[PDB]
């Protein structure tokens, strides 16, 4: 292939869908790496890690949500241009729980500088394994595709 896949486990909402690439959801709530009002797409480098970030970390099992596994296909030449942040080179405090000013400010500086369209960051859950941030305002974000590939049914709180 000439693309690399990243993963979301996402729902449709009233004004945006699970395969959104505009960053509408994170714009509303903020997150570890973005302020409320700044649109960013969050994805994980594995489906397993997406499950940890989406279901386990927010203890959201047992909700009758219509969840979709969403494949984010990133052009390899755009990924080749991504910035890579590591536990080794990130500012101290990036892994605070709850997320605080250090990771939010780092993500804000990256987004507003438009240094790169993509930022690879460690997961706070598994720091050795990466999440992907997409800045939809960046010119190089063109060509990224997102599609629902199946329902996500694995829910640790599922009752048979």
């Amino acid at each position: 292939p000439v693309t690399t896949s990243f993963w979301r486990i996402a729902t449709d909402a009233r004004t945006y869908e699970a395969d959104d690439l505009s960053g509408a959801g994170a714009k509303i709530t903020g997150g570890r790496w973005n302020e409320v009002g700044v649109a960013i797409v969050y994805a994980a480098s594995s489906r397993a890690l997406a499950c940890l970030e989406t279901v386990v970390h927010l203890n959201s099992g047992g909700l009758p949500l219509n969840r979709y596994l969403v494949e984010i296909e990133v052009p390899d030449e755009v990924l080749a241009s991504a910035e890579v942040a590591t536990p080794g080179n990130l500012p101290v405090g990036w892994d605070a729980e709850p997320a605080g000013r250090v990771s939010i400010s780092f993500g804000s500086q990256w987004a507003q500088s438009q240094r790169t369209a993509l930022l690879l960051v460690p997961s706070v859950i598994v720091p050795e394994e990466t999440n992907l941030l997409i800045n939809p305002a960046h010119p190089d974000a063109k060509g990224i595709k997102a599609r629902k590939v199946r329902k996500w049914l694995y829910d640790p709180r599922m009752i048979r």
Partner: protein
Amino acid sequence: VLGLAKLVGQLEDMVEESGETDGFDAPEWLSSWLRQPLPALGGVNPIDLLDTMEGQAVVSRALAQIQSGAFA
């Protein structure tokens, strides 16, 4: 003031928008979630944060992220 009704409403809105409401008992689900460790908040029970305005905001945001898909 706990203001559980506000959180129940937030949860019900989320499920109406993004899931299936039929048969869903939102107060029941919320009761458990509030009293279980929330890894995104460092393993604290969300109920223990509802005694401040700041804590209310933090818990409401976490609840909202369940739907928004932002990582915590």
